[PDB]
Amino acid sequence: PTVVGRIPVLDVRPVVQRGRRPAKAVTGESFEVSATVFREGHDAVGANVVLRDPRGRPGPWTPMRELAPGTDRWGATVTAGETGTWSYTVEAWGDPVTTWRHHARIKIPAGLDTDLVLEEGARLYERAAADVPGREDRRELLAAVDALRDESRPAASRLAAALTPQVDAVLARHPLRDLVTSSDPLPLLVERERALYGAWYEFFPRSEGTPHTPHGTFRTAARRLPAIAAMGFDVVYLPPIHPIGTTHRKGRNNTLSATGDDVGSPWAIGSPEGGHDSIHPALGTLDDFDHFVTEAGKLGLEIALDFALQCSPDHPWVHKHPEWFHHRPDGTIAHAENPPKKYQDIYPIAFDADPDGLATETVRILRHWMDHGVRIFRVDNPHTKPVAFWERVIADINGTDPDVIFLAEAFTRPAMMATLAQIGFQQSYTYFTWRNTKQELTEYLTELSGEAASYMRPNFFANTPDILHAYLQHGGRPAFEVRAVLAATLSPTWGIYSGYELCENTPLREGSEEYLDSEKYQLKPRDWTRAAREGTTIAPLVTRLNTIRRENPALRQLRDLHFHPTDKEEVIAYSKRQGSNTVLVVVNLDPRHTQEATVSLDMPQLGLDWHESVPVRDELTGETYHWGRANYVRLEPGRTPAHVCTVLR
Amino acid sequence: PTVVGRIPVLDVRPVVQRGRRPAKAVTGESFEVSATVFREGHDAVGANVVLRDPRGRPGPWTPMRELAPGTDRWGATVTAGETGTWSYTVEAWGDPVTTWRHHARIKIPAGLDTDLVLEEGARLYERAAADVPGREDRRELLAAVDALRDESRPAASRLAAALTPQVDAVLARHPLRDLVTSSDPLPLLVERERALYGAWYEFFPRSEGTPHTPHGTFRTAARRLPAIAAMGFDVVYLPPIHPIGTTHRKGRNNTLSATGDDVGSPWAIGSPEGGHDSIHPALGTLDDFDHFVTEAGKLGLEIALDFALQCSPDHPWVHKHPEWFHHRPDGTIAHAENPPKKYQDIYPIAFDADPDGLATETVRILRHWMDHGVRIFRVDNPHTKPVAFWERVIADINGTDPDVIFLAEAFTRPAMMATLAQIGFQQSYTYFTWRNTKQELTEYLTELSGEAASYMRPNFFANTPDILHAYLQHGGRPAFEVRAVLAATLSPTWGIYSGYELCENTPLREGSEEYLDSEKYQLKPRDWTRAAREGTTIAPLVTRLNTIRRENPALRQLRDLHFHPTDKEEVIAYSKRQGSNTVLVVVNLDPRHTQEATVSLDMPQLGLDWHESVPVRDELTGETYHWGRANYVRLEPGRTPAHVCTVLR
Numbered sequence A, B: 001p002t003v004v005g006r007i008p009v010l011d012v013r014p015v016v017q018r019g020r021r022p023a024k025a026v027t028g029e030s031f032e033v034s035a036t037v038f039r040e041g042h043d044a045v046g047a048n049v050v051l052r053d054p055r056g057r058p059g060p061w062t063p064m065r066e067l068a069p070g071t072d073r074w075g076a077t078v079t080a081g082e083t084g085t086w087s088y089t090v091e092a093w094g095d096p097v098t099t100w101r102h103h104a105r106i107k108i109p110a111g112l113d114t115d116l117v118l119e120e121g122a123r124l125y126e127r128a129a130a131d132v133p134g135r136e137d138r139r140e141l142l143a144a145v146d147a148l149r150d151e152s153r154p155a156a157s158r159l160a161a162a163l164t165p166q167v168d169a170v171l172a173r174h175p176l177r178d179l180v181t182s183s184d185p186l187p188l189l190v191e192r193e194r195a196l197y198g199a200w201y202e203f204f205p206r207s208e209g210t211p212h213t214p215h216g217t218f219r220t221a222a223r224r225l226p227a228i229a230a231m232g233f234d235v236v237y238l239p240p241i242h243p244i245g246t247t248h249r250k251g252r253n254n255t256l257s258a259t260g261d262d263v264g265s266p267w268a269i270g271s272p273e274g275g276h277d278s279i280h281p282a283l284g285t286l287d288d289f290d291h292f293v294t295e296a297g298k299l300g301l302e303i304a305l306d307f308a309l310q311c312s313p314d315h316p317w318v319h320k321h322p323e324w325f326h327h328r329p330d331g332t333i334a335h336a337e338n339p340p341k342k343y344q345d346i347y348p349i350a351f352d353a354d355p356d357g358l359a360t361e362t363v364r365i366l367r368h369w370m371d372h373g374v375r376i377f378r379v380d381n382p383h384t385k386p387v388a389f390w391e392r393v394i395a396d397i398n399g400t401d402p403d404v405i406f407l408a409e410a411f412t413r414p415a416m417m418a419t420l421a422q423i424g425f426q427q428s429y430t431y432f433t434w435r436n437t438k439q440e441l442t443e444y445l446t447e448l449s450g451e452a453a454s455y456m457r458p459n460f461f462a463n464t465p466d467i468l469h470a471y472l473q474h475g476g477r478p479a480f481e482v483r484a485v486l487a488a489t490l491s492p493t494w495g496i497y498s499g500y501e502l503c504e505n506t507p508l509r510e511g512s513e514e515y516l517d518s519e520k521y522q523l524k525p526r527d528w529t530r531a532a533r534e535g536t537t538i539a540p541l542v543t544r545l546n547t548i549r550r551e552n553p554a555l556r557q558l559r560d561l562h563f564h565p566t567d568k569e570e571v572i573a574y575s576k577r578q579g580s581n582t583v584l585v586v587v588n589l590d591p592r593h594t595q596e597a598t599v600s601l602d603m604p605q606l607g608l609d610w611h612e613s614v615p616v617r618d619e620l621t622g623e624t625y626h627w628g629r630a631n632y633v634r635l636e637p638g639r640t641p642a643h644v645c646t647v648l649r
């Protein structure tokens, strides 16, 4: 047996780890399948993609085209349907009709043995006719055959009968394929919509309390949910909801020693009151949690729980499972670190003494929360636990519950970030917060929307409790408006951490990305009613952005994204498209000065001719413009951070 | 089971067709094996390459290094030994000693947990000693352990004992490797030296005749062999040596009809006198051929025969195997073409009626010539026969006779060129003749010496009977001198077609790459003696270039090649290295005007400091220079095309 087939079909993409892991999509998402296809000699080839669903059923006829002249790289767009494990192959073939037509169009006017050429054509169309299932399509081809063979008619007339639109239409649907050769199947994992698309909001239930009871409960925190839903969010991410250790508990502002009624960090999980399968006693009971989840569901909100595989020194595991920790020669366990960050309040887990025990307990814990309606987990620092551990855990959970979504909170080097996505994480945190200039944004999004989209789905949090970027610190409210527009329109999944909409931007100290008086170490009551009344919140802009996203399919996908040139460094422009929906975004990255610029649209990339002028509506204002190949914009901080335009129909 | 191992080792390279075809090397050739290696958490990893020979025996300890900071890409150089099918794996591991040393060097001078730190070190070195086979090496590590544990000595002294050169040497060779994780093996095909390295000379035996008998024989043509050997060539490539058809025979200058004693094209193979297993009667007998092969062998010349799988209309196959041809409805067979070239004197082979019979006959013909000492075949236009046909034929031949070298004459699109190399062709013709500017040469050789080197071995013919480039037509002798220097120093395999030495450069017409009065269609006697006496040959430069190649290992490999910047567009500079051998070449690509330039050498690429100045000898003249980071050159066409310098030791 040979490695190459009769008609070479090579290097089918997308491909992940040479086929050992699946490429990814979600229901309704389109993407390109491509291959290198050519044959020996000089005759034409054709190619098509065969996408098979989880029951092996092939999709519609999906012909490919050569993507660029002389490259022999062919491609076609496919669209994923129901969730599950699909497969795709590329079929390559000789295209004898295209070949014959090319020669015949030349030879017949030249008078070069025309009877012979026309008979060859007749014999080809006879072959084409035999395969065609449709009775009417068959009679149409056979009529062309008889016209080709009518020696009483002019050569040019015999040939023309073989080239009619009626005949073209038949062959376009049912081409004559020679020597059909197939690639080996590649796997496609199709997952639910929310894996790619959704708006996330992070908040601490304990901060949403009452005058008489400052520490929030699930019942008081449930009253915060309506405002979150009203802002258009789909997912609420909660920090760990478990009992918190007392040994080495951190104080306010990340001080080493807690005093008085300091509440400590939620990530310091575990006490004699319970571990990762238990609820902080001040938050209430599992029944109260069920109420919170029910209320969330009523509002169209899904819960994402933080899963942080680490222990306070008071966690029951410490003495129940000593081999789940690395001990020094004096028996002590070194506290966790993420250099230069130190986490004196927790121990990290060790995995090589009892990997089966840890995996078994991990999926038991996850299934407990799954049984109470949690179908999304935000996984804390997965890159400090073994990659194969997550591959195993995610495979186990999704094996029974393929709807569960895992988000990788891995801010680390690119190889690890990519690998975590490839081995199963549905979503990844990204470098978004550290990409703020036009060049940074353009280069990074070109990366994420390109080949990486075959295995990684970005979740653009504009802030987190650990990341208050200098851009926001220096820029104030207009900078918050800018990053919200960017996050919401560049990724189909974005998020903010509570307080973002209040433009909280006071750092721990100059040069830090930590918040002053961080919510991680103290209750952080916020007077939401007062903020709304006084208009000191960008909640309405957030709400508008999520509405625009919900109304425009272009913003609910990742892979179609194009950057358009402008003549100002501070002004970025880009378009996204999905079917007939086109969104055009122009953002002023300068939060302190008005910028005016000319935006020169790459019109063919919009499916428009260079001279055309198209009506657009700025969905942030309702204003309508007519935009073409060159457009004046004037963007004023605090007033017009950006244009978010839809192309009108 | 997980796809990713305990310590991730991913994307091992080289890889060809995702591991379905072998990467290539030849005996004594070095190349880099690389992989992406990293672990969870913040501690160190190491990695090493395990190269296994055809009997499965592993090579020497071969540790890898990270190739660039922050990339997690690791690499090491390996060297291929005896011919055969080898395999290689990458092993990755936690490197606890490197991590412990890093921390210890900090904590001990800071008085931080010193007794605990030193004991942790002692325990590591004990574990290291466990896997050390040599007793003196074990004792060296145990002495470090005992010193680490000596609480009566100062901490700094205890630490220093673990960091001695003697300890380091043991640990370098026998590191403590945690959690060793291996890639799946990848295949490597190691072939003989001549597959990569050799100088080729093409000539027509029939042109070397006598006054009485103008059509040369093998007996008369053998008289040229000493001159070819004296020029330093290793391989003689002969056009087809079989009978030539009379039907539709081509006349002089590729005219359609032969007249009188016209000899026709050797590629129009076959007559009643015999086919591909026969000798042209005017060349003599098989016994005469054996004599020619024997005489060539005595002079260090291997014979490469043309294998052109096509037929004149008079070939025995036309009536013996009609199904090896495509017949039109009137029974006629269309002549072969390579558009826009037409080959009215031959039929192309059709492969889909009897592919088994064609394969069987093809390997029968090859084995006939192999039995008569031909171990190299120049395969005519392999891209107009099925790719899998060659895959099958080459596998069959190399299965019994792995020394046989096949050269693909496929001037076509990149996908097909690459695929032919990948499915078994030992060597490939290239785009060399159409790369003449500094940018063209730099870009193309960067490609050939890069990733492509894992499956393709280039044969740089500076001309062929079909390719007289305009550069040579317009440039005259200085252009011939330049292209010879380039071909000879940029590829370990190069060649010329007879007459190149005489700077024959008259085209069929302006705009053509054909020779006027081409030797393909007529006997072409040459006055070799007169050219030697009148010095109107560049045979001495050709001789010198092959001598320089034979004396400098850097020129007998492909992958190590670096271009150095110059300040003149017409002047190119590059270096090649193999062990302690360094060759620096500077070429003036302008064949008409003197060019002066400053050559700015990338000194670290030469293994030198930027301030350093090194002695070089121009091997074309024997002159010595001292070259550093900035060197002046003045190259006058006709007087000197280039400097070909060795770095003196």
Ligand SMILES: O=P(O)(O)C[C@H]1O[C@H](CO)[C@@H](O[C@H]2O[C@H](CO)[C@@H](O)[C@H](O)[C@H]2O)[C@H](O)[C@H]1O
Residues within 6 Å of the ligand: A250, A254, A265, A266, A267, A268, A269, A308, A338, A341, A342, A343, A344, A345, A346, A380, A381, A409, A411, A465, A466, A520
């Ligand atoms: O930068 P990262 O390490 O990825 C931030 C996340 O991980 C840490 C550790 O779980 C969290 O850090 C908080 O909680 C720890 C443990 O209780 C504290 O010591 C630390 O000061 C605090 O910042 C962080 O919340 C995660 O998002």
Ligand SMILES: O=P(O)(O)C[C@H]1O[C@H](CO)[C@@H](O[C@H]2O[C@H](CO)[C@@H](O)[C@H](O)[C@H]2O)[C@H](O)[C@H]1O
Residues within 6 Å of the ligand: B250, B254, B265, B266, B267, B268, B269, B308, B338, B341, B342, B343, B344, B345, B346, B380, B381, B409, B411, B465, B466, B520
């Ligand atoms: O450009 P290419 O097609 O790769 C040139 C080589 O292939 C042709 C065909 O075998 C050779 O062409 C010569 O011989 C044919 C057949 O006899 C003639 O019709 C043609 O005029 C002549 O050039 C060529 O020698 C090969 O190198």
